[PDB]
Amino acid sequence: MNCIDTHAHVFSTQDHSIETARYAPDYEATVQSFISHLDEHNFTHGVLVQPSFLGTNNQAMLNAIQQYPDRLKGIAVVQHTTTFNELVNLKAQGIVGVRLNLFGLNLPALNTPDWQKFLRNVESLNWQVELHAPPKYLVQLLPQLNEYSFDVVIDHFGRVDPVKGIEDPDYQKFLSLLNVKQHWIKVSGFYRLGATPSNINIAQQAYNIFKEKGFLHKLIWGSDWPHTQHESLITYEDAIKAFKQIVFDKHEQCLILNQNPTELFGF
Numbered sequence: 340m341n342c343i344d345t346h347a348h349v350f351s352t353q354d355h356s357i358e359t360a361r362y363a364p365d366y367e368a369t370v371q372s373f374i375s376h377l378d379e380h381n382f383t384h385g386v387l388v389q390p391s392f393l394g395t396n397n398q399a400m401l402n403a404i405q406q407y408p409d410r411l412k413g414i415a416v417v418q419h420t421t422t423f424n425e426l427v428n429l430k431a432q433g434i435v436g437v438r439l440n441l442f443g444l445n446l447p448a449l450n451t452p453d454w455q456k457f458l459r460n461v462e463s464l465n466w467q468v469e470l471h472a473p474p475k476y477l478v479q480l481l482p483q484l485n486e487y488s489f490d491v492v493i494d495h496f497g498r499v500d501p502v503k504g505i506e507d508p509d510y511q512k513f514l515s516l517l518n519v520k521q522h523w524i525k526v527s528g529f530y531r532l533g534a535t536p537s538n539i540n541i542a543q544q545a546y547n548i549f550k551e552k553g554f555l556h557k558l559i560w561g562s563d564w565p566h567t568q569h570e571s572l573i574t575y576e577d578a579i580k581a582f583k584q585i586v587f588d589k590h591e592q593c594l595i596l597n598q599n600p601t602e603l604f605g606f
Contacts, residue, residue, distance in 0.1 A: 343385065343386070344377060344564075346388055346528070346560075347388070347563065347564040348387065350368050352364075356392045361391060364565075376575045377410070383606075385411055387411055387413045388400075394416065395416050412433050413432075426466075438471065442473070458484075462487045468487075478513050490523055491522050495563070496532060517554065524557060525561050527560055528563040530572065
């Protein structure tokens with residue numbers, strides 16, 4: 340559990356891309372290729388996350404985990420009406436949380452009884468809840484999630500608005516809602532924050548803020564390989580490189596790459 344990449348996706352063109360997909364990549368993103376990047380950089384572990392365009396069919400990810408059960412865990416996407424038993428079954432296959440990827444979608448109501456039931460189940464399973472969502476959505480979600488004992492994990496610096504930036508009131512509210520006892524932030528995907536070299540500075544500011552708020556041990560990193568819709572501009576090496584720019588101090592790199600994700604994912 341020395342060195343952990345907590346955000347990548349595998350998929351193939353053989354996999355079914357759902358009818359309403361925002362996009363549909365036209366290439367192979369194999370476990371093989373992914374484990375190959377981990378090896379090339381001394382990463383001991385990685386976390387596969389279910390992609391938006393693959394809906395609630397978690398099979399590609401499930402198969403990849405099984406091949407490298409000692410190095411990989413997963414975050415699934417499921418209907419909130421999935422039964423406890425089914426969830427227990429995913430848990431048995433190395434799935435350790437579920438993801439609310441709400442880009443291009445409506446903000447669901449989490450208070451409703453059916454949502455509460457799902458969520459109480461996730462809580463029981465010691466699973467985490469991962470969010471990928473705009474600050475205007477996060478400001479809405481955290482308050483509801485405050486009511487459960489699970490870890491809440493926020494994707495890609497909390498997806499700071501490309502335009503409104505750090506001072507975006509929604510981002511400011513989001514920051515204030517963070518609780519050191521529950522929330523974790525991924526310092527991945529700086530390149531989804533805008534174009535270069537701006538987006539790295541945004542990433543750097545967000546990081547500093549996290550630091551001052553007291554959240555250093557709540558921070559984890561991900562390559563966000565294979566960098567969908569950014570393939571021309573971003574390699575694994577580019578991901579690694581920006582991280583070291585954002586997180587210059589190597590003691591902090593150790594916490595972020597090693598202790599923090601070890602503790603969260605219990606690798």
